[PDB]
Design an enzyme around this catalytic site. Structure first.
Site, PDB file in Angstrom:
ATOM      1  N   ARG A 158      -2.276 -70.887  37.407  1.00  0.00           N
ATOM      2  CA  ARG A 158      -2.463 -70.513  36.116  1.00  0.00           C
ATOM      3  C   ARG A 158      -1.309 -71.181  35.171  1.00  0.00           C
ATOM      4  NH1 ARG A 158      -0.745 -66.125  32.753  1.00  0.00           N
ATOM      5  NH2 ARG A 158      -2.357 -64.972  31.325  1.00  0.00           N
ATOM      6  N   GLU A 187      -4.098 -62.287  26.151  1.00  0.00           N
ATOM      7  CA  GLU A 187      -3.938 -60.809  25.919  1.00  0.00           C
ATOM      8  C   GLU A 187      -4.315 -60.600  24.566  1.00  0.00           C
ATOM      9  OE1 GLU A 187       0.188 -59.878  26.727  1.00  0.00           O
ATOM     10  OE2 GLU A 187      -0.365 -59.686  28.746  1.00  0.00           O
ATOM     11  N   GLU A 205      -1.906 -61.472  35.453  1.00  0.00           N
ATOM     12  CA  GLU A 205      -0.775 -61.284  35.158  1.00  0.00           C
ATOM     13  C   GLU A 205      -0.049 -60.216  36.050  1.00  0.00           C
ATOM     14  OE1 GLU A 205       1.386 -61.798  31.570  1.00  0.00           O
ATOM     15  OE2 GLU A 205      -0.203 -63.602  30.857  1.00  0.00           O
TER      16      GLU A 205
END
Ligand SMILES: *[C@@H]1O[C@H](CO)[C@@H](O)[C@H](O)[C@H]1NC(C)=O
Length: 332
Positions: free
Chosen positions: A45, A135, A245
């Site tokens: 990522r 997010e 995450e």
């Protein structure tokens, strides 16, 4: 079980430039991407910022390491923060130079995403996953896309998604929407329900729902709550799901929050990391269409606490040698 076994290795070049020499578990110097691949990682990522002043994490930076990942046989997950800096629930700072009005901003976002996607394609990089935002639980591109501006958020995400769909990327990547606190079903539900009811962003516009899951920002982040939340997300929208995450400390002498009840017996050590990671991985696998897990910045040794109250969440020694826990990716 998991389709995507990965880590976010964005800081790799920043660390190499800082003098870090990565080594495999035998202590043999080797490129980080090869060390990751040797330990089971199949996807990396990378955070992408629009116009960071020092260039770190900008598109060129990402294309350079993406090529390295590709050469190591690793898939690439591009995480657009749609900001010149860190994007999270408390910060979704408009990229410098971008317009504030929804009409022009939506177009700017589409142009930017389309352009970035084409540049990736032209560099031979076809990410397997692309998140349109990082997010974005409180929205994105503030204040235009700030919650509760649901209409604007849906419109912006629709534009971003189609910036990808109209690009030359071949094959196309899976499009992901990423929210924090994966254990918080109430918030996940609140967000998706209000965004999708707008009509502009359709369920068919994206393919995956990603969530962050950390054990040190609230004792409410139990594995039980994660399981329940993901299960609910899966049966409500039936999208592929992933924990994009997560961290577990090898050292946490000064936590700011009490740890979740069902992880209190896991020790702060490499052994403990493997247990936590394996457990989160299996929680994801137990969910309908749960397909991935990404550890966040395991090799960022110069930022060992990784922005948390815990002293060390990395999976590498301070000298740059992979710890025994890195092999966990070979077992999930
Ligand atoms: C988007 O790109 C087009 C060119 O294809 C340009 O005409 C338009 O002004 C751009 N929109 C914004 C707001 O930058």
């Amino acid at each position: 079980a998991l389709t995507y076994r990965g880590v976010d290795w964005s800081s790799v070049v920043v660390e190499e430039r800082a003098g870090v020499s990565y080594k495999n578990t035998n202590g043999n110097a080797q490129p980080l991407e090869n060390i990751l691949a040797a330990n089971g990682v199949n996807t990396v990522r990378q955070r992408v910022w629009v116009n960071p002043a020092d260039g770190n994490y900008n598109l060129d930076y990402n294309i350079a390491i993406a090529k390295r990942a590709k050469a190591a046989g690793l898939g690439v997950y591009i995480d657009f923060h749609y900001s010149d800096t860190w994007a999270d629930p408390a910060h979704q700072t408009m990229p410098a130079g971008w317009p504030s009005d929804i009409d022009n901003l939506s177009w700017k976002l589409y142009n930017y995403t389309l352009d970035a996607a084409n540049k990736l394609q032209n560099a031979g990089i076809q990410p397997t996953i692309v998140s349109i935002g990082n997010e974005i639980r409180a929205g994105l591109l503030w204040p235009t896309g700030r919650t509760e501006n649901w209409a604007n958020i849906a419109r912006l995400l629709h534009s971003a998604a189609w910036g990808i769909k109209d690009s030359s990327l071949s094959p196309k990547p899976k499009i992901m929407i990423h929210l924090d606190n994966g254990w918080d079903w109430g918030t996940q539900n609140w967000w998706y329900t209000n965004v999708l009811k707008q009509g502009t962003l359709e369920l068919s516009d994206f393919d995956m729902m990603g969530v962050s899951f950390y054990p040190f920002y609230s004792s409410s982040a139990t594995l039980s709550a994660l399981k329940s939340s993901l299960d609910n997300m899966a049966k409500t929208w039936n999208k592929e799901i992933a924990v994009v995450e997560t961290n577990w400390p090898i050292s946490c002498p000064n936590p700011r929050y009490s740890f979740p009840s069902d992880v209190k017996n896991i020790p702060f050590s490499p052994e403990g990391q493997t247990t936590f990671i394996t457990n989160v991985a299996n929680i994801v696998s137990s969910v309908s269409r749960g397909v991935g897990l990404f550890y966040w910045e395991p090799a960022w040794i110069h930022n060992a606490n990784l922005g948390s109250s815990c002293a060390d969440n990395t999976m590498f020694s301070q000298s740059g040698q992979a710890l025994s826990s890195l092999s966990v990716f070979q077992r999930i």
